[PDB]
Design a protein around this nucleic acid. Structure first.
Lengths: 92, 60, 165
RNA sequence: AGGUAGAUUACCUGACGUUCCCAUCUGUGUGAACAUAAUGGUACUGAUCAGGCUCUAAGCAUCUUUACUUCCGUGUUCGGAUGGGAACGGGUGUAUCCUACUUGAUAUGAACCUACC
RNA sequence: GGCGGCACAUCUGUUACAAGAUAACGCAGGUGUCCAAAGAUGAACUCAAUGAGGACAGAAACCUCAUGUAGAAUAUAAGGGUAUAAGUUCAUUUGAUUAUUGAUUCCAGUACAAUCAAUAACUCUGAAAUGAUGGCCUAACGAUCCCUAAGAUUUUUAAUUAGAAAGACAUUUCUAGUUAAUCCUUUAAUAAUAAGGCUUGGGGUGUCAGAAAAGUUACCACAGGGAUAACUGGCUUGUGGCAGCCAAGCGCUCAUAGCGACGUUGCUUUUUGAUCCUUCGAUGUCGGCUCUUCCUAUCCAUUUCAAGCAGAAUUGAAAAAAGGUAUGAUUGUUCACCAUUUAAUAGGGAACGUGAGCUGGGU
RNA sequence: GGGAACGGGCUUGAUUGGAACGGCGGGGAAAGAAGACCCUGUUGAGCUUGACUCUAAUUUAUCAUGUGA
RNA sequence: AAUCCGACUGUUUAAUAAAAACAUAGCAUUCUGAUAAAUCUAAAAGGUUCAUUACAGAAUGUGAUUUCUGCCCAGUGCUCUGAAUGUCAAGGUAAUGAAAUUUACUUAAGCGCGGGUUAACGGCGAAGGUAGCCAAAUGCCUC
RNA sequence: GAUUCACGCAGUGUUAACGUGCAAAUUACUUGUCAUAUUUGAGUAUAGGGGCGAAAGACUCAUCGAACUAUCUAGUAGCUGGUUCCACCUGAAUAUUCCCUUAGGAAGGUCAAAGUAUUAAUAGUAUUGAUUGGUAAAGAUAAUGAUUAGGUGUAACAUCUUGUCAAACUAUGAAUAAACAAAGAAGAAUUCUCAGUGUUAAAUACACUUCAGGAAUUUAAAUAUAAACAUACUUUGAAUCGGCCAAGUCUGGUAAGCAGGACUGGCGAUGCGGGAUGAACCGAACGUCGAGAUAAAGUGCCAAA
RNA sequence: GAAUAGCAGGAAAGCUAUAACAUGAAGAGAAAACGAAAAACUAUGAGAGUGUAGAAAUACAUUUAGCAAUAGUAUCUUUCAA
RNA sequence: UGGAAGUAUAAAUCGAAAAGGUGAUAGUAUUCAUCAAAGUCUAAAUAUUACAGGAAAACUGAUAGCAAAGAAGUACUGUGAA
């Protein structure tokens, strides 16, 4: 919901409790050269129409929020998953 | 085409044909999950006793 | 149709005893449990952390492990047509010493008291005492004679009916 | 007798009054400093002029309550069993198990370690 | 069956039968969220309500004392739990963290998920014992493939200095200093991009162990079903119909000539329901015409009794089912409503009698 | 009567002389047809439509090198 | 003697429907200058209307005559003699890089915006059923 | 593209005949029509997601909401039907989990056959001992909620009584039950000696280590009953998961030979004696027989007494 | 009786062929890279002898042995993880 | 296609060479290895249920074995294919 940046968490690389900066994880841009994308494009070529299922029966309205907690002095990144929330925001 | 949902009829008669199987004695003597120190203490003595038994075998 | 929650149908099972709420005894946290002891699992709903499953309530198990804060209790659980062994780790709050062997442990001491004198009477050469007689179901009472000096008779007969109203 | 720490957690509670305090405990004096709060009321600290007024503790009462026993009452209910009775409804008999509420009598704590008297 | 609903994943109380399990489209409700604090810890305090007092101030503003077992609060449904707290106030903080094990619940003793107990780090709070791996507990959720993130420096190698010990006519080992490379693979060898592996999260399937999916057929077809509807029959009799018990009153006076409220007990299968036992390799599905027979809860005729029976006409009831109970306009109608006639123009059953009996108006 | 709740067969009764001719339409839940009404199949087909996925026809853009300005 | 339907002659479900159904003439709408419109074909100096040329060819609705065809361009169609920088593909251009790749810019119709059209689909409390007609082969209540 | 009759043709009615027919559509009478949008022969053209249609989904060789014929093809079918010798032995099922699952499957239970083990590896029972539970009952100025009335003190409020209640109320609380123990590191106990780790302030205390280990002495005891063709199983596999009935039981319903459940016994799968008859009631379960005592139930006749 | 090559006999039969390969003797890991002893321990357990007595078979004491099976231990191989 | 950032074929566009192709993870660089495409022929070892001629058989024995043990693709049906 509301979680501030500037956490203080155990850093596995430093073996210590160091300051961390907190952001929200966003799905990266889809690559056109990954194996599953290349295989999908091959199937869609030619005649045969749609070759793979297209999901259209969504039910969930929210998403679990994953925080990207990053060590400031060592850049080590941790991924923490929160519960589903309709509205999320990073504090001051 | 409604059907009967459930019944415990004949279930106890079935379960007693080959009656309630008891666990064997070796099921009660498991050690997994025991105290860490007690396992450390037991292992130390077993290693000590075995190493002392083996030097006797070498002697004779 | 009940639900399938962890603590379903526990309105009266998890209710504290009448005039028995709040903190518990200190003998509960001071009793000494050793491996092989007999204990009774009693779900104390005042402590929600580590509450044993309601199906183990009132069952008598044996101590198989002693940890810094919890006691390893071993119970038998009935399944489809077999019995399995369940190994729980329960804090001393939810367990209680069992008196299931109270009478047996006395009989064990009674025979050992006689055995102690036997090894001493044998040194002196006197006859040695016998072990205590085994328990029997209530045996048929023997013939006994009743003195007529302090006896009184009261006739027993059917009673005339009287309307309660 | 008193004080500290307790375990059982009302036989220990609650109301009405009574009895001492020799030590102990309590209430009692003060605010400079540690510390405290709107307030030295609390908590804190420094102390000993007074006091059994309260607390605590001991006892009183046809005291509420609570705790044991009888009774309630083998009456409620109940496990097993008819080609038993009844149109039903429900209720026997047999071999057995057997409460509760109430009422009455009694009780109003026992007990562990340390110190001081 | 459809329409409705979700009893499809799910939690609480109850039905539910004092171990566990436990049904119905049984009953009363709830979930797809909310929280940087509403998580963690320490300290101080005691709540709802009431009584008595205090300028405005009064039934409700704020202050004081006393009583106050929670009758308050605790994010939410319900049930549990909680008083020097689990509630209120104040203060510090991020353990709502990383890694490795063994168990318990659901259970096939599978996964997911939840509940624990420990160990190794690093922390937070406190004087300290302890406590802390999210929320006081029971719900608050998700596989394969695919996409997308994070992680694999703790150590192992090679080359060259310095030293040392074994080694057939070269080369390995140990030691310190250095420099370089370092999770694995892209198969002739390397390089920087690219891609693929391994561990753990997210994106999501609510039909919630998880296809990607609009209708209509009266032009219809096939495999089947009385596991299942439309008609008879069968159990039931709410509803329809008929009959009783009591007696407050009506009946000019008069409970009972004739009625009979408030209540209450039955019978019938001539209504309509409720059910799904028989029939789906078929029991021809309405009415009318025709014809026979049966029931009486009798409309007429016969014999009786009673009256608020003067006569006449009537009304209530008993014996009695051997005999009678009509013609037409409209409507397919059963029914209905009119016009007559009659001693009366009663009510019903027989596979809602009766289609290798008719008819075919209805459907 | 009970029985799969409408027996020719079973139980208890009523009752029975063997073979049949002409009629007859009560019964044989008479014959004809693996119900066409209804439902169920993870069985079809005709027709319809921004149901899903495609496709002919039509259409638009680019490429496919005639000379001189 | 009246009423309903179809105007009339005609046609129709061979084997349960001969009709109120279809056709019809009349009326109206749409497209097309012929290398076209419609349209058969896998293709084609291929085919049909077409030995034709708008008084024609092709596609439709209503259904003789008389009388009259009301209001609506919002929605879905159709159309425009129109819209540029709202969104738009393959391409083309440029930059980086060792290169694949990546990025940026520019591109048609269509959709979106604007105008027309209801004898287009349709609606008539964008406009609120006008003229008429009626328990109608159309009215449940209703006999 | 007027009205009619006739030769012809059709098919309005009889809803006539016939309906195992003359006929896989005909006959008779009645009716209609009977030349220009008329009737008709032969030739010819159009072919199956096609043709042709004054439009009925009509016709396209008795075949049309997509002809006929042959091949793929013995198409698939969780659905219906059938599935062939004898004696003997054992002998079921309708719970639980998952499924686009509900007429079906897989895990699992019940069952059979094979193959083992001297076997800490017996119990659908009772007794004694220590418990667990919140049902029947009970209660109602005992907490929550409902509810009639009467006193006493200051309508109302207190207070003492009174009558009647609760599936989603409870102090108390059975009966029937659930899970323990009644001597398996291998049947006890005692004495001496005694080690490794750790706990601990330190231990000679304590914990675990075959009550580490080792040696002597004593010893077969520790409720009842039953149990060696006992007990423990291992592997492999079948069928089945539509069920129905009874009741000193329960829920929805007015109720049902209704729908759905808890425990047990049955029928299904089961004949026999009795209830006249009957899947389930009562007695009792079955190799072929003889003689006897019996069970349920019967003894006027049918019918033994 | 892998193909295949020879033999007698004429033979779809029979006999012979130092032999490719299959399964196994080693297992873990995605892969790079690796690759199993404390010449084992503990408990119960099959069997074999003697003595005595009942006295017919058989029943007790005592000496030794410890296989199979089950459970548990050290140690070792590989793995992020046994 | 097993061939996975393209194994093979074909079409549209484009299009080489003081040669070059391949080493199946796309890209560039340097080595290494091995071949030298875009013309042609070629015996032997191999297949065979047409048809013809033979030999066998744990095959069938007139409802079996081919549809056909006789004037059997005959009699007969259909407009025709069949």
């Amino acid at each position: 919901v509301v979680v501030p940046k500037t956490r203080k968490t155990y850093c596995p690389r430093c073996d210590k409790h160091t300051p961390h900066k907190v952001s929200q994880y966003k799905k990266g841009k889809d690559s056109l050269h990954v194996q599953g994308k290349r295989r999908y494009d091959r199937k869609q070529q030619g005649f045969g129409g749609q070759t793979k299922p297209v999901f259209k029966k969504k039910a969930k309205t929210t998403k679990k929020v994953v925080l990207k907690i990053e060590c400031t002095k060592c850049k080590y990144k941790l991924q923490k998953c929160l519960k589903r929330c309709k509205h999320f925001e990073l504090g001051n | 085409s409604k059907d009967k949902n459930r019944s415990s009829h004949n279930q106890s008669h079935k379960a007693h044909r080959n009656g309630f199987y008891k666990p064997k004695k070796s099921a009660y003597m498991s050690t997994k999950g025991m105290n860490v120190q007690v396992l450390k203490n037991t292992k130390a003595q077993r290693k000590f006793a075995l190493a002392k038994k083996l030097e006797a075998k070498k002697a004779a | 149709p009940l639900s399938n929650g962890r603590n379903r149908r526990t309105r009266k099972l998890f209710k504290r005893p009448f005039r028995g709420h709040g903190l518990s005894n200190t003998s509960t946290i001071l009793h000494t449990y050793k491996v092989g002891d007999y204990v009774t699992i009693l779900c104390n709903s005042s402590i929600q952390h580590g509450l044993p499953y309601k199906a183990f309530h009132g069952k008598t198990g044996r101590v198989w492990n002693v940890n810094p804060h919890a006691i390893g209790v071993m119970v038998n659980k009935k399944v489809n047509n077999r019995i399995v062994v369940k190994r729980l780790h329960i804090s001393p709050e939810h367990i209680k010493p069992s008196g299931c062997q109270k009478d047996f442990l006395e009989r064990k001491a009674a025979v050992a008291a006689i055995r102690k004198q036997n090894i001493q009477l044998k040194k002196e050469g006197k006859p040695l005492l016998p072990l205590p007689a085994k328990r029997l179901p209530k045996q048929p009472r023997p013939a006994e004679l009743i003195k007529g000096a302090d006896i009184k008779f009261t006739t027993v007969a059917p009673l005339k009916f009287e309307e309660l109203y």
